Symmetry: D2
Subunit: 348 residues, 4 copies
Amino acid sequence: THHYPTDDIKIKEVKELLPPIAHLYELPISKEASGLVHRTRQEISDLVHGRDKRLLVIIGPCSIHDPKAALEYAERLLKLRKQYENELLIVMRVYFEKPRTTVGWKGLINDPHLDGTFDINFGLRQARSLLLSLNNMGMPASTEFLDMITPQYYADLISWGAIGARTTESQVHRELASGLSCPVGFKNGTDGNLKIAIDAIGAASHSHHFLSVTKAGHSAIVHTGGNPDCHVILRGGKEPNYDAEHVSEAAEQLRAAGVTDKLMIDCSHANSRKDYTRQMEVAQDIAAQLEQDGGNIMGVMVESHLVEGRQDKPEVYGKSITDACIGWGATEELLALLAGANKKRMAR
Amino acid sequence: YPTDDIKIKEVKELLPPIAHLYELPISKEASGLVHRTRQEISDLVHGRDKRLLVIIGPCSIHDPKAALEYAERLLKLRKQYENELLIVMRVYFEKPRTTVGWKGLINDPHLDGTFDINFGLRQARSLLLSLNNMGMPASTEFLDMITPQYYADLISWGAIGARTTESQVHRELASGLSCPVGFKNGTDGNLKIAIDAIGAASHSHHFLSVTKAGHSAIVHTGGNPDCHVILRGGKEPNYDAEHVSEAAEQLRAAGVTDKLMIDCSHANSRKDYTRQMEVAQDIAAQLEQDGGNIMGVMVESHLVEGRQDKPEVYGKSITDACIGWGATEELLALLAGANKKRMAR
Amino acid sequence: HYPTDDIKIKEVKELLPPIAHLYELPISKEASGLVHRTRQEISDLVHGRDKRLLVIIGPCSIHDPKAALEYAERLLKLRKQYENELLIVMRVYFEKPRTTVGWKGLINDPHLDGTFDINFGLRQARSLLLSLNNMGMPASTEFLDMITPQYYADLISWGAIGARTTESQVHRELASGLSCPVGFKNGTDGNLKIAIDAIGAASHSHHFLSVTKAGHSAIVHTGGNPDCHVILRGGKEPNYDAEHVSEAAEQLRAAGVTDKLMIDCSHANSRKDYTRQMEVAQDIAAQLEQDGGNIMGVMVESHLVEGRQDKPEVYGKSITDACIGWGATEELLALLAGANKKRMAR
Amino acid sequence: HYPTDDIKIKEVKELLPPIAHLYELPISKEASGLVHRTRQEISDLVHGRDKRLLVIIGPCSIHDPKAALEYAERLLKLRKQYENELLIVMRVYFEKPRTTVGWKGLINDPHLDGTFDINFGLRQARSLLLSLNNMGMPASTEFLDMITPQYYADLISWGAIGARTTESQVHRELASGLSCPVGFKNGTDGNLKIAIDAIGAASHSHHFLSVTKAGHSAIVHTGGNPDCHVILRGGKEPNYDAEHVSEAAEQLRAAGVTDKLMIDCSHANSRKDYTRQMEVAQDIAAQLEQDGGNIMGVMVESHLVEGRQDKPEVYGKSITDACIGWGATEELLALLAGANKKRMAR
Ligand SMILES: N[C@@H](Cc1ccccc1)C(=O)O
Ligand SMILES: N[C@@H](Cc1ccccc1)C(=O)O
Ligand SMILES: N[C@@H](Cc1ccccc1)C(=O)O
Ligand SMILES: N[C@@H](Cc1ccccc1)C(=O)O
Ligand SMILES: [Cl-]
Ligand SMILES: [Cl-]
Ligand SMILES: [Cl-]
Ligand SMILES: [Mn+2]
Ligand SMILES: [Mn+2]
Ligand SMILES: [Mn+2]
Ligand SMILES: [Mn+2]
């Protein structure tokens, strides 16, 4: 050439996203939602720092692919949230995407129509809409943040947030966490590395900068204040790491690092060895721990839907199309089991 | 009750990419150097050419004057060894860290906690343009999904670091970077995350970023066919023939390019800069014997050797310790001679 | 350091960008067909290819979307009724420029209380414009600035540049890039030269500054607008009569631009008296019956209820210039249709 | 789906936001001081708190920054020499509006070749404006649209709204938020009322659409500009003489706005003849000697070299309106200095 091309050589298309502010204008957080979010955050902070011995329970589908079923799930769960409010602090898992190495559906935000149309403007509007409806009905929500831009669209509706095993060591994700309004859980690494999560809590506690967009949708540098409400999530690795031996080892490491030694345990994913029928075993092991001692457990995580298992196409209502989940009946047993176990712990 | 930006001190709009692009447009010559160098590196990744890519330079740039002088010296050697080595300057603006400390030239250019990013972005672009204009291609690590909009048009080779190789969004980024991309193996030696990254990054993805004009955007990528692995050590170093052979088998097994890069520094030197030469000597011996799966090396080098906590000495690192200029001359002559023998078979 | 920037500015507030409104209110297929078709139909009148009369008719200003829609439903019946003689397009002006303090219109101040809720005002304007086209009623508007068109010009079948801006270079540059045909009003005191010059200017390629659909400062490069014409709206004295029309047509021909024009029955032509709009229309009818070859359109200020009021108390009654009511509007349209039917039969 | 959007648009491209230019060319302390003081000094003249004569003087249009700066160096000596009698501010206008095709000025088309490199034009305009303020020469300009002021109004000590836009509502809204004092020109044909009306309007709070310094669609809420005044530039006939000044003053007083005004020596007051600016100046000088209490300023079109040329071949000679040369400028300023020196004895 004269001028050889060097910009966007491997880019098919860049399209504007509607700014966060457009979504916020259509769907402003209500007074009720605001109160629920503010309260639930403070309450979760109390658990993280050992000021309250109630058990945080992040529970719900692996991924949200159908708002209607999410809203029905929320209705059922709400009754249990209330029933168990003295023993457990129940928050719905509302993740819009499962990260994956191979190609496949990129979730409800990226691809709301489930057909590779990538209608993100729609997806983001749908995602905000659901999160607002959840908070309005009295069901707080949690989610995993996969990038540094989506939080501007709906983090104001999030009571608890996660950074996944594949990004816990990522500098920029730690930076993000240090500025999220909600408490944040850092999952241990894919193969069980706990150190990255312990390091992440220390890092995310401090002030940081990272790049994102303003609510008006423009390139921005963000200066964080630190997030003092971070904690570990044990989700297994090569072997599961839910039992008392592992919880006690993690707590030693946490204390040795001088960060909170209250942690959360995932009943699904690697701790269930990718088998949804084993989540109850994990919970039952956690129940047992809480009865004997369990001083370092502040939370658990469970993959649960209306209907159990999984499907590869979205044919059955309330049935996951990502990781398999325990159905509603087992959800009822699992929660009873945890509430009764924790009732005793709080009394001791 | 407030629920938004509870833990945010400030959100500040940046000058858009178009502003920096207006002040510092890529020149014709620089676009040719970038275009050519990218293809040349693609040829190494895909086994078309047997020159050895050498990504060499400071751990991190904290002073552009010293980087330009470094580049001037390096350029003569890039030219001298062009039939055996494809020399490209390491121009990394930041070293990621867990503890508190300096966040690099882009984030904090004045080295004083002022975080003058607009200036940092300008200075980074300015340096990269100057380097390309003098004949020196540049390489960098991309730590997020927005900075590439400011200066990726000037980068001939990019890296994704050990701590981000497994991150989905960073792989999605890699899938639309105009340059070839190296993925580093995990902090403790995990090669699979890099092998998976190359696979993921060869496909078309979507990720969020900004347009050149600074507006929140969705990016639809075409996939990046020119990705490869970088061996940078783990619990043990992984630079030797035995580790190379195992990585190459796993790469072939995965159906991705089995040509890789070996970092002489970081966890392969185990943070002793004086051990880089020893790693390079082992690499040289591999190239002389066979070394068919090696397409490149990485070396942390500066004008003056070692490191210092404050930028007192000119041309000396304030992040990881580097070999100095004399050792650099020796290492490059060494690798040139060894690869000459490889290429002749 | 002394401050020198924004010294007399209370506030600068970023708006929602056009793309935000366009996403909530995309133009429908049906509204697109109507807009596209009506612009071409008007082009054909402007250039003498069709002899139907363009009738820009409706409220002085829109202050109540409900009444606007009711007005449209009634007007639609007549648009259809007279479609062989008249091309009826609804007047949908959101603001009346004024010199003194007062309401700045439905876009700038939709709540009519000086809250200046512009985001709401732009949304409601777009929404009203979309509902109008969807029911079969094309819309017309005056563009007062260079940024508002990005929010709703896609919904506009005919656009005006008023007496106070016809001579404005930047408004001529705007007109040169508007998707719709454009009418330029003669000056406040009757100056026609500014409108003739405007047509010439607007037919050529220009640049002017605005925003992109995403809301970013932009330079706009236009193709030129071949479908501009003049609008006679009076001055010191009215200029609607055959003798004024005749002279304006000669001056248009001498400038090498279209000698087909529009006559406003209202404003300075009615001497600010809405009960004279019918007399102007009667004079126009008499011209169309005799010859009237240079008339391609008329403008009428019309509402559900006649007159004007200071506060919006009575439903369907103007809060800006006094308009004829619905009954008078039926008579005025019958008169014009009847006169033009005869013109078209020659 | 028929197309309805941007049908007659060739291209919309982003403009660098104001903040990009402000980052590269921040106002200096010195320039901020000069601007601040000069604006204050001019408001004093507008309201008759001081009796020095504002002289807006310089090229019709800027097409070459080098000549502009050279011109400024020469003017600076006389600005200093006459500082007790005259307040000399350089005319730094980047474009002359026109009806026919031709050069669209230094901002729109800095390369004088039809390439419309507007980013470069805005940059060059701000650059020149900053250099002028830094050397000690304050600057004045005409604002043609609602966006360009965001790029350099912080460097402007006096602004003009031209004859073709004085009646424009949006341009009055702009004026009401401009940090400098503003002169409104009488109409093209001599109409003074639009300018008197403009002063009233611009004194109040208004809204208008523009962009934020960051380059995004915005609504601007202004505070009102108390420092507006009329500029008499002729029309149907020259309006520089004592009788016309007296009529204008009476009319200003009746509208309850400042009866201090500016008289343009050029344009229609010179009958388009650059050799008559000295004659107008002489008439003004005789008024200042006798009484001239309503005069607060004059405008003059002046360059290094007299006359005009179609192509920018000769250095320092206008390619728009013909100007007096540097020699006649020296004579014209000495004349006005001496006459106002006498006026100031009363
Ligand atoms: N708005 C986020 C914080 C954030 C700001 C800016 C960018 C990204 C995230 C929260 O309230 O948690
Ligand atoms: N501009 C980048 C690709 C990219 C586009 C958009 C966002 C991020 C990265 C390149 O040429 O490599
Ligand atoms: N979008 C307008 C033209 C326009 C573009 C940009 C700014 C202003 C107006 C139309 O289609 O008529
Ligand atoms: N910045 C201008 C005022 C202004 C603001 C916004 C838009 C246009 C003009 C000044 O200081 O005079
Ligand atoms: Cl934008
Ligand atoms: Cl656009
Ligand atoms: Cl602003
Ligand atoms: Mn899952
Ligand atoms: Mn390093
Ligand atoms: Mn009216
Ligand atoms: Mn002139």
